[PDB]
Protein backbone atom coordinates (compact mmCIF):
# COMPACT_ATOMS: atom_id res chain seq x y z
CA UNK A 1 0.00 0.00 0.00
CA UNK A 2 1.57 3.35 1.00
CA UNK A 3 5.07 3.72 2.39
CA UNK A 4 6.01 4.16 6.04
CA UNK A 5 7.01 7.79 6.85
CA UNK A 6 10.54 7.05 8.02
CA UNK A 7 11.68 10.35 6.53
CA UNK A 8 9.60 12.24 9.10
CA UNK A 9 11.38 10.39 11.89
CA UNK A 10 14.91 10.24 10.56
CA UNK A 11 15.05 13.61 8.80
CA UNK A 12 13.22 15.66 11.44
CA UNK A 13 14.97 19.00 11.80
CA UNK A 14 14.80 18.90 15.62
CA UNK A 15 15.11 15.85 17.91
CA UNK A 16 13.92 15.33 21.48
CA UNK A 17 16.05 15.13 24.59
CA UNK A 18 16.60 11.56 25.78
CA UNK A 19 14.77 12.16 29.13
CA UNK A 20 11.79 13.47 27.19
CA UNK A 21 12.15 11.11 24.26
CA UNK A 22 9.78 11.23 21.32
CA UNK A 23 7.64 8.27 20.11
CA UNK A 24 6.00 8.07 16.69
CA UNK A 25 3.68 5.20 15.83
CA UNK A 26 4.17 3.60 12.42
CA UNK A 27 1.29 1.53 11.04
CA UNK A 28 -0.62 0.52 7.90
CA UNK A 29 2.30 1.05 5.56
CA UNK A 30 5.17 -0.58 3.68
CA UNK A 31 8.52 -0.38 5.47
CA UNK A 32 11.32 -0.59 2.92
CA UNK A 33 14.49 -0.74 4.98
CA UNK A 34 16.66 -0.30 1.88
CA UNK A 35 16.13 3.44 2.32
CA UNK A 36 17.73 3.29 5.73
CA UNK A 37 20.89 1.27 4.99
CA UNK A 38 21.36 2.95 1.57
CA UNK A 39 21.59 6.34 3.37
CA UNK A 40 24.92 5.24 4.87
CA UNK A 41 25.52 8.04 7.33
CA UNK A 42 24.66 5.53 10.06
CA UNK A 43 27.38 4.52 12.49
CA UNK A 44 25.11 2.22 14.55
CA UNK A 45 22.60 0.01 12.81
CA UNK A 46 21.86 -3.08 14.91
CA UNK A 47 18.85 -5.25 15.63
CA UNK A 48 17.60 -7.61 18.33
CA UNK A 49 15.51 -10.71 17.70
CA UNK A 50 15.68 -10.22 13.90
CA UNK A 51 18.49 -10.23 11.46
CA UNK A 52 19.47 -6.76 10.22
CA UNK A 53 19.90 -7.81 6.60
CA UNK A 54 16.47 -9.48 6.42
CA UNK A 55 14.21 -6.62 7.58
CA UNK A 56 12.60 -6.35 4.15
CA UNK A 57 11.09 -9.86 4.54
CA UNK A 58 9.20 -9.16 7.76
CA UNK A 59 5.72 -8.14 8.94
CA UNK A 60 4.67 -6.70 12.34
CA UNK A 61 1.44 -5.51 13.93
CA UNK A 62 2.89 -2.08 14.74
CA UNK A 63 6.28 -0.40 14.68
CA UNK A 64 7.20 2.37 17.09
CA UNK A 65 9.98 4.80 16.45
CA UNK A 66 11.47 6.48 19.50
CA UNK A 67 14.06 9.14 18.96
CA UNK A 68 16.33 11.44 20.97
CA UNK A 69 19.92 12.75 21.25
CA UNK A 70 22.65 11.38 23.56
CA UNK A 71 26.45 11.38 23.54
CA UNK A 72 28.27 9.06 21.16
CA UNK A 73 29.70 7.06 24.04
CA UNK A 74 26.17 6.47 25.43
CA UNK A 75 24.81 4.75 22.31
CA UNK A 76 26.01 1.48 23.88
CA UNK A 77 23.45 1.97 26.63
CA UNK A 78 20.60 1.81 24.13
CA UNK A 79 20.23 -1.96 24.26
CA UNK A 80 18.35 -4.59 26.33
CA UNK A 81 19.85 -5.23 29.75
CA UNK A 82 22.41 -2.35 29.83
CA UNK A 83 23.05 -0.19 32.90
CA UNK A 84 24.13 3.42 33.32
CA UNK A 85 22.41 6.73 33.77
CA UNK A 86 20.89 6.67 30.27
CA UNK A 87 19.56 3.05 30.39
CA UNK A 88 18.46 3.36 34.01
CA UNK A 89 17.12 6.95 34.33
CA UNK A 90 16.20 8.16 30.81
CA UNK A 91 15.33 5.45 28.25
CA UNK A 92 15.09 1.76 29.05
CA UNK A 93 14.51 -1.14 26.66
CA UNK A 94 12.89 -4.40 27.85
CA UNK A 95 15.08 -7.48 28.22
CA UNK A 96 13.11 -9.17 25.43
CA UNK A 97 13.33 -6.23 23.01
CA UNK A 98 12.62 -7.03 19.33
CA UNK A 99 13.63 -4.13 17.10
CA UNK A 100 16.54 -2.09 15.78
CA UNK A 101 18.76 0.70 17.13
CA UNK A 102 20.15 3.20 14.59
CA UNK A 103 22.40 6.15 15.38
CA UNK A 104 24.46 8.73 13.59
CA UNK A 105 26.78 11.58 14.49
CA UNK A 106 24.82 14.89 14.58
CA UNK A 107 27.65 17.23 15.53
CA UNK A 108 26.86 19.42 12.50
CA UNK A 109 23.27 20.03 13.68
CA UNK A 110 23.13 19.65 17.42
CA UNK A 111 26.28 21.28 18.67
CA UNK A 112 26.51 25.06 19.01
CA UNK A 113 29.45 27.37 19.59
CA UNK A 114 27.77 28.76 22.67
CA UNK A 115 27.02 25.20 23.87
CA UNK A 116 23.69 23.58 22.95
CA UNK A 117 21.23 24.42 25.78
CA UNK A 118 18.18 22.25 24.99
CA UNK A 119 19.46 18.63 25.05
CA UNK A 120 19.13 17.37 28.63
CA UNK A 121 19.50 14.04 30.49
CA UNK A 122 18.34 12.92 33.92
CA UNK A 123 21.20 12.12 36.21
CA UNK A 124 19.45 11.26 39.50
CA UNK A 125 16.33 9.17 40.19
CA UNK A 126 15.00 7.27 43.22
CA UNK A 127 14.58 4.09 41.18
CA UNK A 128 15.28 2.81 37.69
CA UNK A 129 12.77 3.38 34.90
CA UNK A 130 10.65 0.50 33.73
CA UNK A 131 10.99 -0.37 30.01
CA UNK A 132 9.58 2.41 27.78
CA UNK A 133 8.80 4.55 30.82
CA UNK A 134 9.19 8.32 30.40
CA UNK A 135 9.86 10.65 33.33
CA UNK A 136 9.80 14.43 32.69
CA UNK A 137 9.54 15.59 36.28
CA UNK A 138 11.95 18.17 37.69
CA UNK A 139 11.67 17.53 41.44
CA UNK A 140 14.66 18.32 43.63
CA UNK A 141 16.39 15.03 44.40
CA UNK A 142 17.19 14.12 48.02
CA UNK A 143 20.66 12.60 47.97
CA UNK A 144 21.13 12.65 51.72
CA UNK A 145 19.11 12.01 54.82
CA UNK A 146 18.10 15.72 55.08
CA UNK A 147 14.73 16.43 53.39
CA UNK A 148 14.89 18.96 50.60
CA UNK A 149 11.40 20.49 50.85
CA UNK A 150 11.61 21.39 47.17
CA UNK A 151 14.70 23.60 47.60
CA UNK A 152 18.03 23.02 45.86
CA UNK A 153 20.98 23.04 48.25
CA UNK A 154 23.59 20.74 49.73
CA UNK A 155 22.75 17.12 48.88
CA UNK A 156 19.47 18.37 47.34
CA UNK A 157 20.17 18.24 43.60
CA UNK A 158 18.53 19.46 40.45
CA UNK A 159 17.90 16.18 38.58
CA UNK A 160 18.57 17.10 34.93
CA UNK A 161 21.72 18.40 33.32
CA UNK A 162 22.49 19.77 29.82
CA UNK A 163 24.95 18.03 27.52
CA UNK A 164 26.11 21.47 26.30
CA UNK A 165 27.37 20.03 22.98
CA UNK A 166 30.01 22.22 21.34
CA UNK A 167 31.47 21.54 17.85
CA UNK A 168 34.96 20.96 19.30
CA UNK A 169 34.07 18.10 21.64
CA UNK A 170 35.89 14.83 21.04
CA UNK A 171 33.93 12.20 19.23
CA UNK A 172 32.74 10.21 22.25
CA UNK A 173 31.23 13.46 23.59
CA UNK A 174 29.63 14.62 20.37
CA UNK A 175 25.83 14.41 19.97
CA UNK A 176 24.34 11.39 18.23
CA UNK A 177 20.77 11.17 16.98
CA UNK A 178 19.22 7.79 17.82
CA UNK A 179 16.11 6.07 16.47
CA UNK A 180 14.87 2.95 18.25
CA UNK A 181 12.44 0.92 16.16
CA UNK A 182 10.26 -1.45 18.20
CA UNK A 183 8.80 -4.36 16.22
CA UNK A 184 5.52 -5.26 17.91
CA UNK A 185 3.77 -8.58 17.35
CA UNK A 186 0.25 -8.79 18.79
CA UNK A 187 -2.47 -11.44 18.26
CA UNK A 188 -3.96 -9.35 15.43
CA UNK A 189 -3.48 -8.66 11.69
CA UNK A 190 -0.13 -7.16 10.75
CA UNK A 191 -0.05 -3.60 9.38
CA UNK A 192 3.69 -3.02 8.73
CA UNK A 193 5.28 -5.29 6.09
CA UNK A 194 8.41 -4.95 3.99
CA UNK A 195 8.62 -5.88 0.30
CA UNK A 196 8.76 -9.57 1.34
CA UNK B 1 33.23 24.83 56.55
CA UNK B 2 31.69 24.66 53.12
CA UNK B 3 33.21 27.47 51.07
CA UNK B 4 34.54 28.39 47.64
CA UNK B 5 38.02 29.94 47.99
CA UNK B 6 38.62 32.59 45.32
CA UNK B 7 41.97 33.09 43.62
CA UNK B 8 43.38 35.33 40.92
CA UNK B 9 42.49 38.98 40.52
CA UNK B 10 44.50 42.12 41.13
CA UNK B 11 45.13 45.49 39.51
CA UNK B 12 44.83 46.22 35.75
CA UNK B 13 44.31 49.19 33.49
CA UNK B 14 41.10 49.68 31.49
CA UNK B 15 41.07 47.21 28.63
CA UNK B 16 43.06 44.70 30.70
CA UNK B 17 42.34 41.04 31.42
CA UNK B 18 42.01 38.81 34.49
CA UNK B 19 41.09 35.20 35.20
CA UNK B 20 39.53 34.49 38.56
CA UNK B 21 39.00 31.02 39.85
CA UNK B 22 37.30 29.55 42.87
CA UNK B 23 37.81 26.13 44.34
CA UNK B 24 35.28 24.22 46.40
CA UNK B 25 36.32 23.48 49.95
CA UNK B 26 34.40 20.94 52.01
CA UNK B 27 32.27 19.72 49.12
CA UNK B 28 32.64 18.63 45.52
CA UNK B 29 31.29 20.78 42.77
CA UNK B 30 29.93 18.43 40.16
CA UNK B 31 26.23 18.60 40.62
CA UNK B 32 25.99 22.23 41.70
CA UNK B 33 25.39 25.34 39.66
CA UNK B 34 27.89 28.05 40.69
CA UNK B 35 27.67 31.80 40.34
CA UNK B 36 30.23 34.58 40.36
CA UNK B 37 29.17 37.66 42.33
CA UNK B 38 30.81 41.01 42.86
CA UNK B 39 30.55 43.63 45.55
CA UNK B 40 31.52 47.03 44.17
CA UNK B 41 32.50 49.63 46.80
CA UNK B 42 29.54 50.26 49.18
CA UNK B 43 27.14 48.08 47.09
CA UNK B 44 25.32 44.75 47.51
CA UNK B 45 26.77 41.55 46.14
CA UNK B 46 25.36 41.22 42.61
CA UNK B 47 25.38 38.10 40.45
CA UNK B 48 27.52 38.59 37.36
CA UNK B 49 27.70 35.16 35.75
CA UNK B 50 26.56 31.59 36.51
CA UNK B 51 27.17 28.14 35.10
CA UNK B 52 25.10 24.95 35.50
CA UNK B 53 26.42 21.77 37.13
CA UNK B 54 27.46 20.15 33.86
CA UNK B 55 29.02 23.30 32.42
CA UNK B 56 26.57 23.10 29.54
CA UNK B 57 24.65 26.30 30.21
CA UNK B 58 26.04 29.70 31.18
CA UNK B 59 24.38 32.99 31.91
CA UNK B 60 25.68 36.59 32.12
CA UNK B 61 24.35 39.91 33.31
CA UNK B 62 24.01 42.76 30.79
CA UNK B 63 27.01 44.77 31.90
CA UNK B 64 29.45 41.88 31.31
CA UNK B 65 27.97 39.98 28.37
CA UNK B 66 30.55 39.57 25.63
CA UNK B 67 33.43 40.43 27.96
CA UNK B 68 33.34 37.68 30.61
CA UNK B 69 33.39 33.91 30.13
CA UNK B 70 32.58 31.52 32.96
CA UNK B 71 33.66 27.88 32.78
CA UNK B 72 34.38 25.03 35.14
CA UNK B 73 36.55 21.96 35.54
CA UNK B 74 34.64 19.53 37.76
CA UNK B 75 37.61 17.15 37.97
CA UNK B 76 39.51 19.98 39.69
CA UNK B 77 36.43 21.23 41.59
CA UNK B 78 37.16 24.72 40.23
CA UNK B 79 35.11 27.37 38.47
CA UNK B 80 36.76 30.13 36.40
CA UNK B 81 35.86 33.65 35.34
CA UNK B 82 37.81 34.99 32.33
CA UNK B 83 37.45 38.78 32.22
CA UNK B 84 38.41 40.72 29.13
CA UNK B 85 38.06 44.37 28.12
CA UNK B 86 37.94 45.40 31.77
CA UNK B 87 36.38 48.72 32.77
CA UNK B 88 36.66 50.87 35.92
CA UNK B 89 33.06 49.86 36.77
CA UNK B 90 34.22 46.22 37.07
CA UNK B 91 36.23 47.17 40.17
CA UNK B 92 34.83 45.08 43.03
CA UNK B 93 35.49 42.16 45.37
CA UNK B 94 34.48 38.99 43.47
CA UNK B 95 33.03 35.86 45.14
CA UNK B 96 31.71 32.41 44.17
CA UNK B 97 28.64 30.80 45.66
CA UNK B 98 26.23 28.00 44.71
CA UNK B 99 23.15 29.17 42.82
CA UNK B 100 19.92 27.37 41.89
CA UNK B 101 19.35 25.69 38.57
CA UNK B 102 16.40 26.77 36.46
CA UNK B 103 13.85 24.07 35.69
CA UNK B 104 15.45 23.65 32.24
CA UNK B 105 18.80 22.88 33.91
CA UNK B 106 20.16 26.42 33.29
CA UNK B 107 21.25 28.73 36.15
CA UNK B 108 19.99 31.84 37.96
CA UNK B 109 22.10 34.55 39.57
CA UNK B 110 20.92 34.37 43.20
CA UNK B 111 22.90 32.46 45.78
CA UNK B 112 21.04 29.89 47.81
CA UNK B 113 18.94 31.74 50.39
CA UNK B 114 20.58 29.60 53.08
CA UNK B 115 24.11 30.37 51.97
CA UNK B 116 26.22 32.48 54.30
CA UNK B 117 29.70 31.17 53.51
CA UNK B 118 31.04 33.87 51.27
CA UNK B 119 34.77 33.74 51.21
CA UNK B 120 37.32 36.39 51.46
CA UNK B 121 36.47 36.90 47.81
CA UNK B 122 39.22 38.37 45.65
CA UNK B 123 39.88 42.01 44.82
CA UNK B 124 39.63 43.35 41.26
CA UNK B 125 40.72 46.94 40.57
CA UNK B 126 40.57 48.47 37.11
CA UNK B 127 42.22 51.91 37.04
CA UNK B 128 44.43 54.37 35.11
C1 LIG C 1 16.59 11.98 4.34
O1 LIG C 1 16.89 12.99 3.35
C2 LIG C 1 17.70 12.59 2.23
C3 LIG C 1 17.89 13.82 1.36
O2 LIG C 1 16.68 14.49 1.00
C4 LIG C 1 17.03 11.42 1.52
O3 LIG C 1 17.88 10.95 0.47
C5 LIG C 1 16.78 10.30 2.51
O4 LIG C 1 16.13 9.21 1.85
C6 LIG C 1 15.93 10.79 3.68
N1 LIG C 1 15.75 9.73 4.66
C7 LIG C 1 14.62 9.01 4.77
C8 LIG C 1 14.61 7.97 5.86
O5 LIG C 1 13.66 9.18 4.03
Author numbering:
A (entry chain B): 333 to 528
B (entry chain A): 1 to 128
Q: Could you give the paper's own sentences about this structure?
A:
We previously developed two hetero-bivalent nanobodies (Nbs), aRBD-2-5 and aRBD-2-7, with potent neutralization activity against the wild-type (WT) Wuhan isolated SARS-CoV-2, by fusing aRBD-2 with aRBD-5 and aRBD-7, respectively. Taken together, aRBD-2 retains the binding activities to all tested RBDs of major SARS-CoV-2 variants, and its hetero-bivalent constructs by fusing with aRBD-5 or aRBD-7 displayed increased affinities, even though aRBD-5 or aRBD-7 alone is partially ineffective.
Residues D420, Y421, F456, R457, N460, Y473, Q474, A475, N487, and Y489 of RBD participate in the interaction with aRBD-2. aRBD-5 and aRBD-7 bind to overlapping epitopes on the concave surface anchored by the β-hairpin of the RBM, and bury 697.9 and 669.3 Å2 surface area, respectively. Ten (L452, F456, E484, F486, N487, Y489, F490, L492, Q493, and S494) and six (Y449, G482, E484, F490, Q493, and S494) residues of RBD are involved in the interaction with aRBD-5 and aRBD-7, respectively. Structurally, E484 lies at the center of the aRBD-5 binding epitope, and its mutation may deprive aRBD-5 of binding affinity for the Beta, Gamma and Kappa RBD. Besides E484A mutation, BA.1 and BA.2 also encode Q493R mutation, together causing a loss of binding by aRBD-5. aRBD-5 failed to bind to the Lambda RBD, possibly due to the loss of hydrophobic interactions with L452 and F490. For example, aRBD-5 loses four hydrogen bond interactions with the RBDs of BA.1 and BA.2 due to E484A and Q493R mutations, but when aRBD-2 pulls aRBD-5 close enough to the Omicron RBDs, there may form one hydrogen bond between Y32 of aRBD-5 and N487 of the RBD, and two hydrogen bonds between S54 of aRBD-5 and S494 of the RBD.
